[PDB]
Symmetry: C2
């Protein structure tokens, strides 16, 4: 399988990394991108919303600069206004947190010939499900179908670990992640420094959760995932160097 | 349930157990305290004579913590003094080829580790990494030494494929990929890839002290293959990784 990135195709024959760059409370962020690129990041994932709509000042300035590195860039935004601007600047992947529930986001991606990420999260986010795996699978597939039939070239599915989900829900989704991978679409996961990792590894500080995050991600890779959103790029590249040679 | 005999108690292998490395070669109670706090189930002490003055004094102090202690040594003289002091596990560095070590383990009622290496001499073993079938040959050596040790009175034997001992990357890779076949021999399996060349090669990390992420990855793979005993330098990192891994894969 391959991942379409607006004007290039990335093969998923090996695990690919999306290096996270959080622009939430500059030129001191461009070197961090060049830093992750040097560490092995395949895609740079920029997000500015944890805010008002003029979050364009938090993103666009950095986005344009980062785009000059020649590396694919994913933009995390809910607002179609922000996305459209990011796309006409060169964005390669549209990461919709609200699971593309916004028809404007769908239309945008289809119009720019860019793939979109469909992440799961409660309609609103209450962590209450009759069957979390069955429900998330259904939502992801249904949203993907809507996007594809609307013109979006490709859809990436993200279970949305941590979003409206308690430990039991995140565990269930991870254990049956192969079933989400079996829907055919490329699957993306991001458990870096998340509460789930803290809960299972006993690490109080989110900033010190690299080992549990790597462990969770290797498990996801074993389940068939080939796209990971991570904070510690180098740690994952080193771990994958070993893992991919053994599995 | 599967367990590991440790001189005067049994350790359940219902979950992965860690042997924290404490190398005393060119306080120790403190670091030992730290490793125990970090999650080490067994403390591995090795000073690889003068080997006695360096190990014994420390071994006695560390033993007072009440945590099982594994001792690594090639000299029976040191092993006997360590066992007489109370060490709980006899780790080998020659493949348990010395009958004297076998006798000590059985006499003191302690389990012994049988680690594979083509030849005991560390300076010549890389000249003996020419296996026709490394997995088959390592399995044969381990099972043979296991039978010999058990028949001589040793209560239990722990098998270690000896990663990085007289083995090319191709050999270490083959052994890791088919580690389940060694686990299938029925004895508890111990692996130690911490900071090893294999990790440096596959992860692209030249500094041995900076190989924790590749080591954790290799060890999680070993755990997936069935291994429940890991010899590690970074105890906390492994406890954190296992907290996640064991909750998921189980």
């Amino acid at each position: 399988r391959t991942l379409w990135l607006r004007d290039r195709a990335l093969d998923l024959d090996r695990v690919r990394l999306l290096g996270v760059l959080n622009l939430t409370p500059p030129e001191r962020a461009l070197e961090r991108a060049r830093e992750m690129v040097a560490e092995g990041a395949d895609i740079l994932d920029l997000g500015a919303e944890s805010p008002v709509e003029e979050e364009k000042r938090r993103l666009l300035p950095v986005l344009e600069a980062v785009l000059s590195l020649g590396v694919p860039v994913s933009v995390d935004t809910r607002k179609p206004e922000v996305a459209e601007e990011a796309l006409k600047l060169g964005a390669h992947l549209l990461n919709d947190v609200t699971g593309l529930r916004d028809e404007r986001m769908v239309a945008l991606a289809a119009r720019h010939g860019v793939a979109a990420v469909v992440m799961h999260m409660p309609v609103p986010a209450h962590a209450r499900y009759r069957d979390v795996v069955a429900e998330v699978k259904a939502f992801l597939e249904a949203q993907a179908r809507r996007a594809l039939s609307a013109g979006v070239p490709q859809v990436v599915l993200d279970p949305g670990f941590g979003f409206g989900k308690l430990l039991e829900h995140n565990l269930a989704l991870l254990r049956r992640l192969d079933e989400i991978v079996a829907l055919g679409h490329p699957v993306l996961v991001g458990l870096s420094r998340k509460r789930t990792i803290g809960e299972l590894s006993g690490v109080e500080d989110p900033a010190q959760r690299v080992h549990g995050s790597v462990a969770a991600h290797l498990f996801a890779v074993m389940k068939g995932v080939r796209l990971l959103r991570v904070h510690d790029v180098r740690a994952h590249r080193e771990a994958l160097g070993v893992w991919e040679a053994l599995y």
